[PDB]
Write an enzyme that holds these catalytic residues in place. Structure first.
Site, PDB file in Angstrom:
ATOM      1  N   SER A  47      50.925  42.310  43.290  1.00 31.38           N
ATOM      2  CA  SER A  47      51.267  42.168  41.882  1.00 31.38           C
ATOM      3  C   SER A  47      50.119  42.485  40.930  1.00 31.38           C
ATOM      4  CB  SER A  47      51.818  40.773  41.607  1.00 31.38           C
ATOM      5  OG  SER A  47      53.106  40.639  42.188  1.00 31.38           O
ATOM      6  N   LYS A 185      44.843  38.829  36.805  1.00 27.19           N
ATOM      7  CA  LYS A 185      46.128  38.946  37.479  1.00 27.19           C
ATOM      8  C   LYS A 185      45.929  38.718  38.973  1.00 27.19           C
ATOM      9  CE  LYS A 185      50.439  39.504  37.989  1.00 27.19           C
ATOM     10  NZ  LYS A 185      50.335  38.422  39.018  1.00 27.19           N
ATOM     11  N   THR A 186      46.725  37.818  39.555  1.00 21.16           N
ATOM     12  CA  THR A 186      46.732  37.610  40.995  1.00 21.16           C
ATOM     13  C   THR A 186      47.650  38.621  41.688  1.00 21.16           C
ATOM     14  OG1 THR A 186      48.527  36.012  40.724  1.00 21.16           O
ATOM     15  CG2 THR A 186      46.279  35.131  40.860  1.00 21.16           C
ATOM     16  N   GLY A 187      47.432  38.774  42.990  1.00 16.57           N
ATOM     17  CA  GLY A 187      48.384  39.437  43.854  1.00 16.57           C
ATOM     18  C   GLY A 187      48.325  38.801  45.229  1.00 16.57           C
TER      19      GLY A 187
END
Length: 238
Positions: A47, A185-187
């Site tokens: 993501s 932003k994480t993923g």
């Protein structure tokens, strides 16, 4: 006052984790890299790709702004925060994949391909399908390549309208303190929680810095590692 990145050490944040951490000082043009080998390995973005999807989607007017509503279809998915109507911004904050899959479909294969070459985004391989390619699929990008892209976004030296970049930055805000703003932003590879990212930048009263963390663990782990480093080195204060 000013953090000199050539003096840092982050070994103990990764003593039990296969990972890399990159920190770029925008004012001084200096980059610190923990684990150079892993920093150069292309990996699926998960993501973290929402950053790119949002920029393209706003630029081509496939979405109107951070509040563009797409209605939930009523299907119960893995996270309860996904099981509600979403906007471009809330789907970034909650990582509601289904929203960004609809956006990617509206962008379309040919437009996505041209934009990924404009943006030099990893291997640029979208053969995994217009709404799957960033999710444990065909597209890969190294942590250093992510840094390069995010540094251009921080500097606003990308071919997007200024308000588009301002909107995407606002959607990435994680914390607004008195003396700093953390954007990120994480993923996570949700199939097995085995790949994790936290990417972004931090604005302080003594310069801004771009960071990328990537681990053989969850995105939450990547974010917690990043926050620990930014606190230890005086960038997150209050």
């Amino acid at each position: 006052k000013h953090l000199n990145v050539s003096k840092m050490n982050v070994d103990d944040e990764f003593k039990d984790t296969d990972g890399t951490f990159i920190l770029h000082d925008l004012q001084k043009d200096q980059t610190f890299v923990y684990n150079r080998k892993r920093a150069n390995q292309r990996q699926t973005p998960q993501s973290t790709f929402k950053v790119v999807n949002a920029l393209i989607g706003l630029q081509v007017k496939a979405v109107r702004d951070e509040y563009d509503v797409k209605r939930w279809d009523g299907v119960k998915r893995e996270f309860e925060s996904w099981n509600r109507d979403h906007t471009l911004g809330s789907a970034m904050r909650e990582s509601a994949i289904w929203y960004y899959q609809a956006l990617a479909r509206d962008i379309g294969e040919e437009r996505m391909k041209t934009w990924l070459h404009t943006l030099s985004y990893g291997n640029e391989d979208i053969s995994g399908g217009i709404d799957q390619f960033w999710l444990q699929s065909s597209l890969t990008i190294s942590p250093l390549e992510q840094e390069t892209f995010l540094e251009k976004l921080a500097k606003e030296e990308l071919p997007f309208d200024k308000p588009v970049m301002k909107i995407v930055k606002r959607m990435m805000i994680q914390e607004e303190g008195d003396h700093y703003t953390l954007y990120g932003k994480t993923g996570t590879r949700l199939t097995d929680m085995g790949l994790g990212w936290f990417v972004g930048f931090i604005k302080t009263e003594h310069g801004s810095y771009v960071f990328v963390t990537n681990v053989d663990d969850s995105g939450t782990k990547a974010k917690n590692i990043t926050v620990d480093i930014l606190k230890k080195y005086g960038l997150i204060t209050s």
